[PDB]
């Protein structure tokens, strides 16, 4: 109501203002924004809080000295001599008693004591000897180190000095702690030598505003005398706020403006009464505050100039996140991840709304100055590149697609190398090369290049490429230090280099990296202060909590877009913090929680989340095989599907091609190797869910099982990867040839007798042959057959290994191998030599195993589980079956099943049985309900998962 | 390397304290290196004696035997300037000083100490080049016109001038005239130099004890007060050792002379050796040090924990940050060394624990410090070093009346007068937990105002943060409140005028530089870095498990709760912490099923305050909390009794606080719903049931949800006589409220007050209600709504009440027909009930051409009670009914795989006995248990179908 009227009054006052006062306000606001504003409030400020004046105390001194008050008024000297006459004649204790009974009072702070601190002054120099400004600072939440005496100058903890040049009363209401009289003003430079120098240092290095003074004060003229001693242009002219009832005469204005003061009169700027001081004090102060709050921005040239002044620093950076953009305009607007802007704290003009109004209409944009037109063009290009498209009120359709156009993210190691081995056009060109060297391993060269960038950019404006290079040098140093903490302590780095980085990065304080910047990289780029901190994704990891709660931007889309923004900020701006454990943990948690939340919503069918190329790259880079396995044993990835299968295929091919460039060619790069092999393992493991072309699967499989390292992927892991790949494709014959080539290579490596495949899952070359047969039963491995035909009798390792691959051979090959059969096998057909030599259990086998089972009767009444499985599968069929009853429990279970006691049937057999056998036990009469009941009793009173995957899969 | 610590051993007491102060100032960013001409000489920069001799050579013959005096050092250049001119002076300056000397290592040892400023008396560029090479930005200030235009806060202040504006005699202070009117030509440079000298630690290097600059500086320091200034740290590296009389003379003049000739035996020309000796001493002293004896283990640890004595409890995660990541204080009480490459002070300290032989050697003041440190480590739960011990007793105990729900003792503390600011700090948080946010904000502001002396500053910072969070709570409430608005608009004006432009991220950065060093762990309370480590561990452990992991989650959660509730921080009542508690406890309880989690009193209060009813239902569906016991069931019972008494005091005793209500009604509802799992005494049962059925407001718990809560209560506690009487009183109250024709049970799930009669009967089957029967015998035949109520409670009435009621109420509507099915005395289905079902079906057909019971009519048709084959002619849209009356036509794809949860034993057995529906239902249940984690479907599968 009345506040709005006061705002309109301030607006029209600013509109009807000369260029001198608006320039004074502009400089005061720019000092308040650079953190260089220092207020020099005086006695007039505290009087508005009704604090006792000094004419009252000099009146008391005159009344207690001469018996009566003054016959008129006191001059400047009589304000300093009558207290001195009282001190010299009466004494000290009476002086302090009067000071106590006049100054012990407690008065509340006036609103101007809060308007003063609302401008965020660097220091507050005060001539007041009262704790009113101390009270305002303490209530406001700003710790201003109070410096009352010279014992406080050295003991001033913080760098925010609340300097009381006249003294204070915190050490008692005595005259020795304040400057009040003669012999205390004459003796000020020899009783107060350290706050005088501190006041004269704050004044010379900052911007000074004199608030509560008249242009006749001792504490104004003594400073005007000191600046007269100074040189010309050696110091900034201090600002002076004048709030006297009468307007300033032009002669006095000229006199005090040539003396050093930039007077901002209030009686010549507002209309008020003689005794209305709080109106004048709260007029110019309100003018500065509302100017800082952007309440006086009217022209579209000032709209463009404000946004340009806040954004055009960030032109050096290749991407700025929406969170960073919010931090730019002091939380006035919320730039959302989808690109819509909403006003949050802007209490002044809508400069962003006006900017987008200029964007939509070309005719109003033409109604602008040419320089401001080009500034608008620059801002428009910036905002359309970063994704800020318009306000939410005017938001219509908007596609949220990400584009991280950095060669480091997309793989592209060969293009990265080609870019590295070139001539650097500029320093920002060398910054990309340094980050790229860090990406593909060469951390020594990356550290050296970052040092060179720092050296060349020490003396250079807009020092992002200096600051960011220092940060990435400290992070590549941390990466080297951690590399030789866990890989050592092969040999990645030399010892001369390590000593050099420890002799260079000895006391590099990353905390003080931002505070060591030249005060322009403190305001223009305060959005980059978060990079020097050790942890910077804490505002994002706790946003993942909105994902895990169970009951146009939901929680799913906003965290994925914020993940993309963090990814596009580190990869496009080439920041090495993208490889640390914090960012890897962030990506892991965010993608895992996104997939888990999608699975939770999908499983609410009791009453999604397609992932594109940029998601596949993240689950290949920042995930591990265990983490993807943890997602596999939970979320149904078979439904979360995949998109952009052409770019995922080229990603996997570039990963597969680099695999056959690091093992086929001479690639050690052991620090690059550990990261890249994790990426390759995760990518080729996650490639089960993407459809690949014939040549795509051809190159990837050929990499997987010819050029992948043996140590990282054994033959079992290679088979698991291969089977996961062959699920989705149909395994074209060009790739079955590749698997056959692997088998012939392993057979030829088995020519050397002292060789044995080491597998971690027990899954071997026989199962590669099984995969070949189970997609193509009509297949004869020709080269394997040539090995069979030209194989000697005494090459035992080849004999057994290539026996394990019998179906893949010809009939002549089979007979050449079976030239060394066994007929002494007591049961040696499936102990280690199980391939499928069974086919028909002829009496050459059947009767001989029956003789062995007679020997087993001899061993029992005075190898079995396979007899039971074999007979129940009708593989043994003879009248000699029901001879040797009374043997092991499983014999009674399988051989005489319609009389068996299934209570003795051990529960764990079904966990180690054969799946086709469980399929056969499903269809029968008695074993049907008995395995039903034993498996049900396992489901209730036991704690595993094997029994549940049999009851529900087979039977019913 | 080791010779440096040998020198450390040989250091005198006066030297070893000087290095400690210098290193401390370097770590506090208060070091300023006053470099001189003895350091640039190590680079072989042309000394002024060569140029004085050159001025002598071009003007005064050639040499001057005697090496000149200081007056002769400053007069021959002045005589040359006066007579031979200025251009010749500048020409000789250009001939000598335009050189490219390489920077000596001391230039890099100075900047390796991280000096705040560098006040050089040299006119050279070697320190500028050293800063440029190292990577330090120093705003070089050579002239007066650069003081105001200083780019950075760090100053490379060249007091004597510099040749960066040309090799001229005007830009430097070299002659006698330049040294006489120096303060007339350089006022701002002098003021800056004196301000830096007064407000920093000056470490003069490269000077002699003569050195006119040093003499003028000491003369100026003489004019200062007695102990106003700090004493500068002169580094003397002259060849001869300093005479003791000279050191006495200069030490009383201001300088703290660190000698080098009395520090290392070197030649008469090994200046680099002495400079490097002192500089390397300082640099190697930066890394911890000063901790060799047992009386220094109790001052370095007391130098990092004695601030933390005002905090009532701190986290072990915070304890890791306290000791600069030297040790990783684990949550079970072990202290794993992480980056303590120097002396093992934790090991030594825990060795001085017990072991009275070691403690007796310790000094008496160090003994009190050790007792304080031991009490601190005992209170916070730190036991000892990692490899030592291992028993590691659990059970963190949060002692706070806010956590335990003591809403009456908190009021007592609030009402009583307080004797300390920390008592008001507890009182303000107690007010905040009690809803009274206005008095909370006012008392917090009073604490900030009255924390003036308070040299710790942790009762001002925590109160400022808590006032910010209570202001956020008030603003978010009045935003959400749009009940009533409890805060007067004057209060909103006060909180939005005082607490505007107050950013919480500027509070810590702006504190005393001591408070930013000690109480550093308090800086996470502003932003969300407070939970960052614990949230990361929670996410990683949620991925992993699905000193053992389950214990790691629990102990970290209890650490976070004991940091917030015991320190009385309002950050506990915010969203992020609530989600942290909820996710951690959900992870623990889910981990229990994979195994076991005992669950204690401290768990029950956590799953009541921070969980919601929806999350409770999620945990009950997914996992099983039934077999998971709840340990201490007497402290849980007192908690539930306190909650019942609080809702009683809130509703039946008129006075209620809406801001307190909004927080407490989300916890009372959760605890009384989670009270199923705890055994409750008859007294506690009666209290919380008579507070649930009568005093819980109907806007937050209607009849149906009240009944859900009540059936949950009567599972582990049965339904005794006193609770039966309570439910009877509830039914009586409902009857006298339903005497009015405009009253109706508004239920959100469909379990009306008839179900309460069913619950009473289910545990009794013979509870004749005397008062309800008395209510029945007032039949006026116009008070229908009442007759219908007691019709729904017909089994609860007596034989006379049944006789009077059934003489008026009969079966003439579908609703009272299904009510008759529920209450009984229908059983036999005479044709009128079947055709009544058909009439309801007709009224449904009227909608069909264009709250459902067609499901239970399909149920009845499957249950072979009704047999009218015309019901198939009225096949509708509810596919339960299509399933039940036409199994073959019903496609089971549209069968929502719910509806099996709410089926009885007999009906599920009936679906078991029909081929098509049976096999389709195995398919449905199978896919349900593979995709969904609910166990009810699995129970159905192997109770009726497997």
Residue numbers in the entry:
A (entry chain B): 6 to 494, 504 to 565, 577 to 632, 644 to 898, 912 to 1005
B (entry chain A): 12 to 493, 503 to 566, 578 to 626, 644 to 898, 910 to 1005
Copied sentences from the primary study:
DSR2, a Sir2 domain-containing protein, protects bacteria from phage infection by hydrolyzing NAD+. The enzymatic activity of DSR2 is triggered by the SPR phage tail tube protein (TTP), while suppressed by the SPbeta phage-encoded DSAD1 protein, enabling phages to evade the host defense. The protomer structure of DSR2 revealed an architecture that consists of an N-terminal Sir2 domain (residues 1–298) and a long C-terminal helical region (residues 299–1005). The Sir2 domains of two side-by-side DSR2 dimers contact each other to assemble into a head-to-head rod-shaped homo-tetramer of DSR2.
The gel filtration profile shows that the DSR2 tends to form large oligomers. To further investigate the mechanism of DSR2 oligomerization and NAD+ binding, we collected the cryo-EM dataset of DSR2 H171A catalytically inactive mutant, and determined the cryo-EM structure of DSR2 (H171A) to overall 3.18 Å resolution. The resolution of central part of DSR2 structure is better than 3 Å, and that of the very C-terminal region is relatively poor due to the dynamic property which was indicated by the local resolution maps and 3D variability analysis. The overall structure, especially the two ends, undergoes continuous motion. Local refinement focused on the C-terminus of DSR2 improved the resolution, which allowed us to construct the atomic model and precisely assign the sidechain orientations, assisted by AlphaFold2 predicted model. Interestingly, the two side-by-side DSR2 molecules form an asymmetric dimer, with the one cavity at DSR2 C-terminus closed while the other partially opened. Comparing these two cavities, we observed the structures of the C-terminal domains of two DSR2 protomers are distinct. The C-terminal domain with opened cavity rotates upward and thus moves away from the cavity center compared to the closed one. Additionally, a long helix in R1 of the HEAT repeat domain of one DSR2 protomer with a partially opened cavity directly contacts the C-terminal domain from the other protomer, which facilitates the closure of its C-terminal cavity. The interface 1 consists of the contacts between the last two α-helices from the C-terminal domains of two adjacent DSR2 molecules. This interface is primarily maintained through hydrophobic interactions, wherein the hydrophobic side chains of I981, V988, L997, L1000, M1001, and L1005 from two DSR2 protomers form extensive hydrophobic interactions with one another.
